[PDB]
Write a protein that binds this DNA or RNA. Sequence first.
RNA 1: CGCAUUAGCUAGUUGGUGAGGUAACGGCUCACCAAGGCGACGAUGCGUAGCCGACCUGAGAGGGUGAUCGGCCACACUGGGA
RNA 2: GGUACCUAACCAGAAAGCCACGGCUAACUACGUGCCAGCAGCCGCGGUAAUACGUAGGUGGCAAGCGUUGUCCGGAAUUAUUGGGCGUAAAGGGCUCGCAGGCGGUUUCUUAAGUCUGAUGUGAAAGCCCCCGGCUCAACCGGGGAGGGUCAUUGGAAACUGGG
Lengths: 158, 131, 84, 185, 136, 88
Amino acid sequence: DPSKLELEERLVTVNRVAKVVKGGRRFRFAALVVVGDKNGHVGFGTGKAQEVPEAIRKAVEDAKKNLIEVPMVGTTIPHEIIGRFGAGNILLKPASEGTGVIAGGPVRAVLELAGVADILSKSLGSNTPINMIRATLQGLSELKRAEDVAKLRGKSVE
Amino acid sequence: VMTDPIADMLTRIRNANMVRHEKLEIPASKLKREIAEILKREGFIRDVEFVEDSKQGIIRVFLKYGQNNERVITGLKRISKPGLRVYAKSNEVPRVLNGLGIAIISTSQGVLTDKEARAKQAGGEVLAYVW
Amino acid sequence: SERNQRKVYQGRVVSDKMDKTITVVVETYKKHTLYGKRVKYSKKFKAHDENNQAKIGDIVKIMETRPLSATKRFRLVEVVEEAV
Amino acid sequence: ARYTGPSWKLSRRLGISLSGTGKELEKRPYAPGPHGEYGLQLQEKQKLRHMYGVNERQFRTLFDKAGKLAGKHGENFMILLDSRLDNVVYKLGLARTRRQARQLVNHGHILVDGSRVDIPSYLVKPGQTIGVREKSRNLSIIKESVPEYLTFDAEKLEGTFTRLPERSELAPEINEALIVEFYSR
Amino acid sequence: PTINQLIRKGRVSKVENSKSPALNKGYNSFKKEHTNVSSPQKRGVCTRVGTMTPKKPNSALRKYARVRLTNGIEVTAYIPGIGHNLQEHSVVLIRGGRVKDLPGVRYHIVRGALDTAGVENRAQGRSKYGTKKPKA
Amino acid sequence: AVKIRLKRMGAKKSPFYRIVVADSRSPRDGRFIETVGTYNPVAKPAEVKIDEELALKWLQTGAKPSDTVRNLFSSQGIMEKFHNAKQG
RNA sequence: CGCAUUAGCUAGUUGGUGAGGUAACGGCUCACCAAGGCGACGAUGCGUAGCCGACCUGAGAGGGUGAUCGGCCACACUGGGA
RNA sequence: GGUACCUAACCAGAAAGCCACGGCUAACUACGUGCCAGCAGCCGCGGUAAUACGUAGGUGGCAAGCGUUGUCCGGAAUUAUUGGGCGUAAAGGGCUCGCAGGCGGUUUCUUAAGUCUGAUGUGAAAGCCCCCGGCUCAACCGGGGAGGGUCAUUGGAAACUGGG
C-alpha cells in the first residue's frame, strides 16, 4: 500500500525511443524510476510520454502501485541471494555495519531507497537498467525473514 | 545409469516440492534414510515412513507446506558429487543462507547438520545444502 | 635412541627381466591443484632383489637404500602377495 | 603544499560553512564564478577534507588507517581527523580559525605534554595535554581567542584531550557513509 | 566442461598483443638480432615527412612522419600540434598512441624532445606539446 | 670459527644491533645460526637485552664473543656465569 | 614453464659380475656377460628461464614479477685441464 | 661534523605549478577558426550560436608536483574451480565398436588409502598483518605475536569414497 508512506523518488534513466511511421519517426521518453520509503519499501515504475517531466510522473505513479517490502536485519539484508531476471543477475551479500552500499548503478538506487545501509553486490550479468532493477527486486522478494522461517519450520528463532 | 543416488533423492524432493505434491516415494538406502531423518528433525518435511520390500526398501516422505501453500523447502543442492567430492574441515563447515538453511555433513561422528557438526568440532563429506 | 627409518613403499612388480633387479610401480592419488579431483599417478622404482624371488605381477614391499646402481635406490623387503 | 587561497569560495561551492559560523554563506550562498552520484560522493569528501584542511594524499591514508580500527569506518575516520593537533588547538579555542591553529602549531607555539610539536597533522591521543610555549604565552591571536571531549583552562592556556569525540560531537553536516562510498570505488 | 575434461585439457587464456609493437623490440648490433624489451619511447630518424588524408568521414591534411627507429623498424608516426620543424633526417622521439583516423599510424612523435621543436604560441596543455612557460 | 657478534639492522644514522651467533665466514648482515639478543647503543643509556640460556649454551660450545659483545655480556653478568661454570 | 605444426628416445644405454677410482655410494670408469631402460602420467627435441623468502594486483581464487634486502645455485674474455 | 638539534635577531619578505572542464568524469562562458587548422581513449568533434579545435576569464582535481607513454594486475562470473556456455547468437563429434581412463545399486563385516581430528618436528631472518615501544609526527625503525605445507612423524574417529 502507498498512500500512508512518504516516498522519495529517484530517476534511474530516460531513453528516447522511436517508432517508425509513414512520414518518419515518433519519438517518446521512457522514464525508469525507483521509489522508496527508506524504511524497507521500494519499487519501480516505467512511464512513456512525449515530454520528459510527464514520463517521470507516469513512472512515479507506476512505482507506487508496484512496491515490495524488503526484509532487513539491522542495516543489512538477512542472507546472501542472487537475484535473476533474464540475463540480469545480481549477487547481494549481507555486510557489517559501516560498510556502506557497495553496489552498482540501478542496483544502488534500489538498495539506497529501500533503506539498506550496508550491503555488498555485483552485477554478474546484463547491465540493461530495467532488467538490472528487475533482478534486484527478484532478489529482495526472495529474502526470507528469520522469524517467518522459524514459524514455517515449527522452531524457535533461537 | 544411476550414478548419484543422493542427488536423485534431493532432486525427487525438489521436483515433488515444485508441483506441491503431498508425498513422494524414494528407493531407500541407509544414508537416504539418515538424510530424511534430518529433514524431519529440522522441520523441512512433515513425516518420513520406511516401507520394506524384497528389493532395497522405500522411503515415503511427506512434504510440508505452510498456510498460504508456502513451501518450507525453498531449495536443495548436492555439494559433494561422484565426479568431484568435497570435504570440509571443522572450521570451514559451511553456513547455509546465513543460518536459516542447513548443510548435511557425513562425518565419522555420524551424518549431522552443520550446527551439529560444528558443536562436535567435526568436518567431513559435505553431502547437501537445504534452505 | 633407535635408528631413523628409511621410506617404505608397497607396490606392484612390472618387470623381472633384469638380473637381481625388479621394476616396482607405486600408484598414489595426487590432488589436482586447481580442480580438487584426485588423480592416479604412477611412480616406477627399480629395486634390488638378490634371489630373484619377486616376479611380474607380485605385490612387493621395498625399502630405500644407498644407490645400488645408476637407477636402483631400493631393495626388495617382502613379497606381500604373489601373482596369478 | 597547503591551500592558502580564498576560504569563502570553498564554503560557497560546498554549500556549507567550513568556519562553522556562517558568513561565507550570508551574502551569496551559491557556487563561485559566473555560473552561480559521483558528484555527491566527491562533494562530501571535499566537504570534510576542506573543513579540516588536509591534502588528498594525506586524507586518503588517514582513511586507510581508520579502516584498521574496530567499529564504523566513516565514524572512526572522523574521530582521528578530529584528533589532529591543529584541530584540537582550534577546538580548545586557542585559535580563531583552523588556518590560524595550523600556523600556531607549524611555527612551534604549541606544546604537547610539555614538549614542542610543530606538526599540524600530529594525531593527538587521550591523556595528552596541549599547551602554549613560554615565549608565546602572550601572543595577541591567542589572547583574542569548547566541546566535552576536550577540557580547557583559559588562565593557564593549557587544554587536555580527555576522551575520543564519539561522532555526535563531530560535524553533523558530514554524511561519512558517502565518503566511505567515495573510497570504495 | 566436466571436471575430468578440465583435468585432461585445461583452460587456455587468450593472448593480448601490444598496441605499440615497435616500442617492444630492441636490437643487438653484435648479435644482429631483435631483443624482446619494452620501452616507453624510442628514437628514430625521419626518412620522409608529409601529409595524409584521414579515413572518411573526417577531412584534413594530417601531418605525419615515416621514421626508422633505433631497433631498425620503420613506422609511420603522427606529428601532433599546430606546425612543426621536421624534415628528412630529423632525429625524433616516438611515443605510444595510435591516431584513430589515419590507417597505419600507431605512434605519435613527442614534441619538445630531441630535434622536434615545441609548439609555438601554445599556452594551455603546454606540456603535451613540448612548449616552455611563456612569461619568465 | 663460530663467533658471537653484532648484526647491523636499524636505519642510516640510527644503528641497532642484534647479537647473533654466526660462523665467521658468513656476511655480517647475512646467514646466522641463532639470535641471542639486542643492543641499541643509540638510546641513553644503551638498551641491552640478552637471553642467558642461549648465550651460555654458545659460550660453552666455544663460540667466541666479539669485543663489544664480550663487553655486553660482562655488564649483564654472563662472562661471570661462564667462568664459574668452567670451574663449578 | 611453453610447444605434439616435437612421438619415439637410449647403446655405458639398463642390469649383472669383477677390478679400478672417489671423502663417499654409484656405469663413476673399464673388461666381460646379459638386453635391457625411458615414453601418450608426454618421453625426446625445440624454445624460454637462475630458484626461493618475497613483491605488485585482486573480495578471494588467481595472474604477473623475482630490482633493492636475505637464502641457495651458477659464472668470472672463451673452450679445456690440473 | 661544528653536522643534527637548540637559543637569539630580522623580513610576508625568497618559495605553485600541472592537467582538465560534451558524456564516461569533478568542473562553462566569450572570442577566433569554419570538415580548414586541429582534437581524440572511446562514442566522436570541426562547413557561422563549437561548453569537444586555438586562445581568454573562471571553475574543477591534485599539488612540488602534474600530465603522457610503456609494462603488469583489476574492472573482464571475459578460459568461468570459486564463476560461462553449445535448438536458432561461436559451440553436439557423420555413425558405430571399443582399449586406457573417468564414473558406479542395496545390506552387513572389516581395513583405513582417501576423509576428519589430536600431538610433536619443521616451514630462517626481514617482509605482510596484529599488539606495543622509539624518532617533535609520519615514513622509517625496533620488540613481542600471528600467519603460511598437495610437509614429515606418531595417535584417535569411522559416516562417506577406496580396498578386501
